[PDB]
Design a protein around this ligand. Structure first.
Ligand SMILES: Nc1ncnc2c1ncn2[C@@H]1O[C@H](COP(=O)(O)OP(=O)(O)O)[C@@H](O)[C@H]1O
Lengths: 103, 179, 206, 412, 103, 103
């Protein structure tokens, strides 16, 4: 997960123990510190080195996969009354580019 | 002797001071006596208590009763016997095996009359299962007089056949099975 | 016999009454005996209600299942109370350890199941035991199977003698014997070590 | 309502004062065996758990009789606090009891109390519905001679015939499920002896500090081991998916909850389950059965005699089967958000990953509110969309279990 | 035939049992569901299995369904001649490996 | 390989005393004996058990090797023990002594 705020990016990498908050200034990071999920307040006693945010799914959301998700999405359209867990909704959201379960 | 092959080995096993301690503790008949040991030691501990006199040994399932019963036959011969469990429930509409019933009544009579040599040697260890331990029985079953047949006994024939008929013996024209 | 409490109405007695006066009762593995006993009570209950259900018995008054409850299974506590009330002590032998128990100085023989290195380690265990002067014995239910063990004993730095039936082994030599024994026993208090061929080959030959 | 609440506060503070002035033997510090018993713990104690044990031990040591609650999720380890407090009360020579609503909990807590307190001269005993009347009438009930140091029991410990010899500590678990008569019974016991209750339903913290003077309550929020979230799937009821999931859960020798609240058809429903997985031991359970049959069936499901338990929501939400880690919700549209979350929570608590299948019927068009609701739980999210909105409902009945008033008339 | 055809083929015959094998206890009577349930449960109490014979092949599936209704704790499966050999032989392979309880 | 599994005392304390006895004999010869316990707070208990079995025990410094002539109670992750007679080494896990797995 990750949250966007003015000059501050919160991110929880899948391999990191504590979620990390990074303060940007201009076009480079100004500060970095790990925080706690509970109080959302920073933990200063955990030193934060370089963090590597690896992907969270075993795929990349490129333009090609949206293209093929639109070709496959053309069949089984079901534009109206989209069921939650069916494949018209899934492929429709893949053509829209957002990650969905069972992808 | 030839009947008990491992009697001396169990004697040497009973030279152990813990088994002797079991003898001493069981001599004065305590209320509670809890013993802890491996399974293979059963035949020993049983043979321990048998040193003080007769005893009953209740195994969990029938297979344990057969195993331990044979193991004790290796040390006591015909003096140790097995009280088999019914093949059916006490209120199931099926009679148990005639051989099982015969062994049960025969062992009960051997307990009632240990000196009757025709039934076998006097009893030392009686091994059984939980089933036959719990399942009660009519007390007048040991009083039912069996048919004693020996070469030279003075018995009238119709009394013999009538007595067998009274003992639930099935009369056929050619004996094939027991009973 | 299922209708015995209705055909021969005599107050039944337990097995412990037929035992000679004072004869103790040794229950092996009391917990398995207890749970199993409960299972027998449940099963006999089910067969009584099923075979003699008023829906299946007949047309007139039922068979008074309560009256047939007399010959039914006696619970564990009642069997212990009747056995104690008949003069027969209720003694137990369990496998699980207990602080308030007379833990016998008896241990199981080493089973070399699935290991010929452990098997040679059993032969060598008997070797070191008889070199110390300890009592060793091999019980084999098979007729004539003891001779092969004897040959392997004289072959593997040990002494084997076909002990005559009904005899104990002498110190220094392993005494191979014919008789019925499932699992062996090691008693350091009596300096005795008894191995069965079941422990050597992992086979029960009753 | 302002005039209808002070009547409750009166009983609360009067209980606190009667507890304050009551004479009760305090408990000394931990004896030497307590350290070995605490270090025989298979796992590792948690910081919230350690603070909870310190607070409970101190309240036992204070002369005021203890009335403390332990709040934590099912699978967070408060039962260990129960066994340690009970041991501490045993070491001072006072026998203790544990009151549970169902017999299954009496058996579970019985086995945990055996395993944790083994090796010491402490005879633990339980009195459930299925304890035979011989041992019950003789061993358990007749244990007014100090024969039992700790007894785990159901509501049968609350009848008139019972009697204790130096009752030192009472441990209550799931106090909400008890009967009203049994509730007033336990509250009657509160003033005389130390009590210690455990709850899986949380309370609003505003009430925690609002009623802090009359009744101290300790919260545990540190999970003992990372219980990863169950995998939820919202979808149309397809038989092949159900069968495949049930067989996957059966592969690890696991068990599964199948939910069919319409009691009228539950039998047929289970039959259809056996149509999908023939090799599955499938049983039924619902509130219309008498407790003697129901608790026996649930016992069989806890003893792994059955593989799939078709039951209603009332029966499912109230069982702690750790081996069951797969849930099938037929007609998931009919359930509210809170009920769905409760259903899901009862799986995937142990070291195994849980699965949940919220299925809607494919023969009828789903409703708008079912589309929205199912959509909220669809994208599994802890957000303010409803997980928190329906968490408050999980705290409402918790308040009802804490305070005496059940009426929702003045609340509405 | 054993004596007449002894010149071209040799025949041994084992009439002696391997041990004390007991004759089964046979009970004839009216089909009572409770009795069948109690019997099958008794066979299940020693971790044993049971043969339920139902020759009517059109109702054999329904028969197994009713059997599972009588004993829910039983793992019951069907096996008949209308099945192909590939499925039937796998069913038997499962019944021998204690994958099921009643056949 | 010349590797033998550890003797697992099922819980019967005569087997436990026997295991501690073979440890005593091994260290009397001069071989290395190590008791690996992954649990926290159980090493001192093993030291006390070895003391009651009349055996010299030492809680090893994390990362060291057991000294010849003394049994070394060590805190480390192991499931079941291993006996290597070629290295004159006997490793026995707490799991083998208590029949429980510490995760
Ligand atoms: N610190 C711990 N780490 C991991 N698992 C634990 C821990 N403490 C207890 N458990 C496991 O979780 C369960 C403890 O919770 P339980 O006794 O069910 O009560 P509750 O679920 O109310 O906390 C037990 O089954 C136990 O094996």
């Amino acid at each position: 997960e990750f949250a966007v705020r003015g000059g501050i990016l919160d991110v929880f990498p899948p391999t990191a123990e504590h979620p990390v908050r990074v303060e940007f200034w201009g076009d480079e990071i100004s500060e970095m510190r790990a925080f706690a999920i509970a109080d959302q307040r920073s933990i200063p006693e955990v030193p934060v080195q370089t963090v590597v945010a690896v992907p969270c799914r075993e795929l990349l959301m490129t333009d090609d996969v949206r293209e093929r998700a639109a070709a496959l999405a053309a069949e089984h359209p079901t534009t109206e009354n989209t069921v939650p867990g069916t494949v018209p909704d899934m492929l429709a959201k893949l053509a829209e580019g957002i990650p969905v379960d069972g992808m | 002797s030839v009947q008990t092959p491992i009697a001396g080995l169990v004697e040497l096993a009973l030279s152990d001071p813990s088994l002797q301690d079991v003898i001493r503790r069981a001599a004065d008949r305590p209320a509670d006596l809890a013993l802890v040991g491996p399974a293979s030691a059963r035949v020993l501990v049983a043979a321990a208590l048998a040193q003080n006199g007769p005893l009953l040994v209740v195994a969990a399932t029938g297979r344990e009763a057969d195993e331990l019963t044979a193991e004790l036959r290796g040390v006591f011969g015909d003096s140790v016997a097995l009280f088999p469990s019914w093949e059916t429930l006490p209120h199931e509409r099926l009679s148990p095996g005639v051989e099982t019933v015969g062994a049960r009544l025969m062992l009960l009579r051997r307990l009632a009359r240990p000196d009757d040599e025709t039934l076998g040697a006097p009893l030392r260890v009686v091994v059984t299962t939980t089933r036959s331990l719990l399942q009660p029985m009519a007390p007048d079953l040991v009083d039912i007089e069996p048919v004693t047949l020996s070469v030279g006994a003075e018995m009238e024939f119709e009394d013999v056949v009538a007595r067998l008929v009274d003992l639930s013996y099935t009369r056929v024209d050619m004996v094939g099975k027991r009973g | 016999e299922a209708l015995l409490p209705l055909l021969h109405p005599i107050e039944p007695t337990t097995l412990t009454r037929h035992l000679p006066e004072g004869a103790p009762v040794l229950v092996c593995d009391p917990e398995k005996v207890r749970t199993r006993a409960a299972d027998l009570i449940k099963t006999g209950r089910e067969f009584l209600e099923a075979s003699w259900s008023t829906a299946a018995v007949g047309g007139d008054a039922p068979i008074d299942l309560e009256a047939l409850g007399a010959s039914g299974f006696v619970t564990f506590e009642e069997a212990r109370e009747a056995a104690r009330e008949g003069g027969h002590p209720w003694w137990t032998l369990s496998q699980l350890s207990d602080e308030s128990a007379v833990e016998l100085d008896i241990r199981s023989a080493p089973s070399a199941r699935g290991s010929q290195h452990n098997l040679e380690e059993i032969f060598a265990m008997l070797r070191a035991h008889v070199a110390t002067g300890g009592y060793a014995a091999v019980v084999t239910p098979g007729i004539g199977t003891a001779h092969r063990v004897v040959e392997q004993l004289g072959e593997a730095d040990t002494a084997a003698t076909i002990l005559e039936p009904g005899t104990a082994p002498k110190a220094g030599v392993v005494g191979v014997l014919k008789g019925p024994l499932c699992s062996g026993v090691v008693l350091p208090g009596a300096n005795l070590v008894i191995i069965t061929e079941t422990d050597l080959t992992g086979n029960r030959v009753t | 309502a302002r005039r209808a609440v002070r009547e409750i506060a009166s009983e609360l503070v009067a209980l606190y004062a009667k507890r304050q002035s009551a004479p009760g033997h305090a408990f000394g510090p931990d004896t030497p065996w307590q350290a070995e018993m605490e270090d025989a713990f298979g796992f590792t104690e948690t910081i919230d758990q350690l603070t909870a044990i310190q607070e409970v031990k101190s309240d036992m040591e204070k002369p005021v009789p203890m009335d403390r609650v332990i709040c934590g999720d099912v699978g967070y380890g408060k039962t260990e606090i129960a066994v340690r407090a009970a041991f501490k009360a045993v070491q001072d020579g006072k026998q203790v009891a544990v009151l549970v609503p169902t017999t299954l909990l009496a058996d579970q807590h019985l086995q945990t109390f055996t395993n944790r307190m083994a090796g010491f001269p402490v005879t633990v005993k339980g009195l459930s519905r299925f304890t035979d009347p011989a041992e019950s009438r003789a061993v358990i009930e007749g244990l007014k001679d100090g024969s039992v140091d700790v007894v785990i029991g159901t509501h049968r410990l609350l009848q008139t015939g019972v009697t204790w010899k130096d009752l030192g500590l009472i441990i209550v678990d799931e106090e909400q499920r008890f009967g009203v008569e049994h509730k007033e019974h336990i509250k009657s016991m509160r003033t005389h002896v130390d009590v210690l209750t455990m709850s899986a339903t949380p309370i609003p913290r505003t009430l925690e500090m609002s009623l802090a003077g009359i009744r101290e309550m300790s919260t545990i929020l540190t999970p003992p081991e990372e219980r990863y979230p169950v995998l939820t799937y919202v979808g149309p009821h397809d038989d092949k998916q159900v069968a495949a999931a049930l067989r996957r859960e059966l592969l690890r020798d696991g068990q599964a909850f199948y939910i069919h609240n319409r009691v009228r058809t539950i039998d047929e429903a289970a039959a259809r389950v056996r149509q999908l997985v023939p090799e599955a031991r499938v049983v039924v359970a619902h509130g219309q059965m008498n407790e003697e049959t129901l608790e026996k069936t649930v016992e069989g499901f806890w003893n792994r005699e059955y593989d799939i338990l078709v039951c209603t929501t009332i029966v499912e939400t109230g069982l702690d089967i750790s081996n069951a880690n797969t849930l099938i919700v037929e007609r998931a549209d009919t359930f509210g958000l809170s009920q769905l979350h409760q259903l899901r929570g009862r799986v995937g608590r142990s070291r195994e990953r849980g699965y949940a299948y919220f299925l809607y019927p494919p023969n009828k068009p789903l409703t708008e509110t079912a589309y929205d609701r199912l959509a909220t739980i669809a994208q599994n999210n802890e957000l303010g969309a409803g997980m928190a909105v329906a968490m408050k409902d999980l705290e409402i009945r918790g308040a009802g279990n804490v305070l005496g008033a059940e009426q929702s008339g003045h609340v509405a």
